[model samples]
Target: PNQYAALTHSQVQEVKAKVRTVNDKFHLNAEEKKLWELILLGNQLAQNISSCDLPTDNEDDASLVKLTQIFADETLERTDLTWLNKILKIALYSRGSGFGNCQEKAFFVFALLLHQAQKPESLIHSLRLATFNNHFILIVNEQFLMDPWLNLAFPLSKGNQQLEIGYVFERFGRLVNYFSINQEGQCFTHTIERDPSSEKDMANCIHSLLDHRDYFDLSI
Candidate 1:
């Protein structure tokens, strides 16, 4: 049976509302709008997928890392995300491929690590969905920085040291803790002026999804 064959009315409405909240704020180009449409439909159906099959042993981080990289590469190739391609690959059945933003990519990796890799729920619970300099990335246990959207994954320490993260949210998209960290390792809180749907907040998300169509260059 197709997991996404039938979505509940509320499920459809909720996902649509999520997209609409952001979609309404941006003056998206044709490609961006079409991609958002796919995102709405994909997220609605993605709720049904519940099983994953990836090793989660900490003894061999390299094995898990290699597999994740392979999985990320395969998903990018199999799905059609850009406007040049037809909207044929539905993300629901496509292992979260096709059309999506950084949020969508992070969601896919989260699903795999949580369900497939079988990571501890305690760690997942504390995980943060964050954006730095407009790019959506994940902070897993504060040790690793995973950007499945840009196809870039690295240790938190190896990443840009001056990065200042903004708009921290729960994995499920609640605006719970809002703070900015400076290079001096200081944390400052800022009152939320608007939800992540605001143009300012979503600018990097929109930019990353539209501009960086190519996969990550490892040689650099």
Candidate 2:
């Protein structure tokens, strides 16, 4: 219990509203929407399942080899307890190539569960980390949702190398994990922008990349 952030009554309502709004950001067809429900289930199972623990925190970094073994072994049974197999037998949740692509079990599966609890009414996204030019890199917006990578690759260019930080607060109608950044000596700060027109919610994360030199911990 201590490992997870606890929330108050009013605080819960606020986040629920924010999630519904996030659901609108992406457009989905009927097929994808059906698969998206699997996302909702992943998070629900996280509470009861022990194996679904945080990949990064638990040291269960998912790799293609692990996924291939799962795919190769037919005796393996799918259970909600195992988040890795939770999205199996479904085309939409298939594991992608490489370490943390949308298809990767470690990144996508864990995010699905976290997202459901974090953004109950919205779609869960896969925040990827990879190795490029010998430097640790974080990749996002890599999952094309229900679209083909080739079709959206160009449009997704701007989204990549961008950093999005999701934070949680401990108060009512407030409390945030807000952030701002400095690029080349120019600093700008922007907190959550709420549209109370419908009396809505909360979320924490910055939109951009970790291109900042200090952000990358190269110290060894």
Candidate 3:
């Protein structure tokens, strides 16, 4: 409730204005531009959901679902389903304490829902289909499967360490997933070594990944 309450109208407007200012000031490189759009979308979503009067239990969950739908629709052309998934993962998992027992389970459920949403030929055919311009549907498939021990290795801790780790992990995870999914080749192992600067070369790397999947493996 505190999280939702924090997004007052004045604060929301201020944030939007600030984002616009930054977007205009920084001739953001392609990758930076994409990340910027993500930041704006995320803020907008938070503000929109916060403005709505939803039941306490449904607030975060419903907002997350709507966020996923926005991604499925490719409302932000610069970002893909996977990118949105990673952001949602970070948001849900980073809350409360980092990856605690309860939070871990929540993350799995959230991720499962997102993964199902992105499955090929499903109501909203994976990012692959959505990209080609299909009407997006917000449906969470009941039959969607997830690992029984999905949260087995999820780190569980309280205090600042956990919070800091959650923040860093989520950011790194986004970068990693972005590169992996967009890699030009199928395997990342070789490409990762070939391009030592993959972490820094965000835009070019993403383009390369998308162009050549064989050269890079996303599983890595």
Flag regions of model 2 displaced more than 4 Å.
1-5, 49-220
The parts of candidate 3 lying over 4 Å away from their true place are 1-4, 31-220
Give per-model CA RMSD: 18.0, 19.2, 17.8
lDDT (tens digit, per residue) of candidate 3 on 51-73: 11212323445455444435433
lDDT of 1 by residue, 100-216 (tens): 433345555443332311223322322334554334455554544454543333333325422322111112333333322222323233342322222233333334433322221
Distance (Å) between predicted and true CA of 115, model 2? Answer: 17
lDDT of 1: 0.35
Cα lDDT computed for each candidate against the true fold: 0.35, 0.28, 0.28
lDDT of 2 at 145: 21
lDDT computed for candidate 2 = 0.28
Candidate 2 residues 1-220, lDDT tens each?
2122122345545544543444445566775555455533432322221221122122243344345436534323443212222222221123332222222332333333333323345343433333222111222234322111101111122353121112211122221211111112122212433223211111211111122222212123
List the lowest-lDDT window of 10 residues for candidate 2. Answer: 146-155
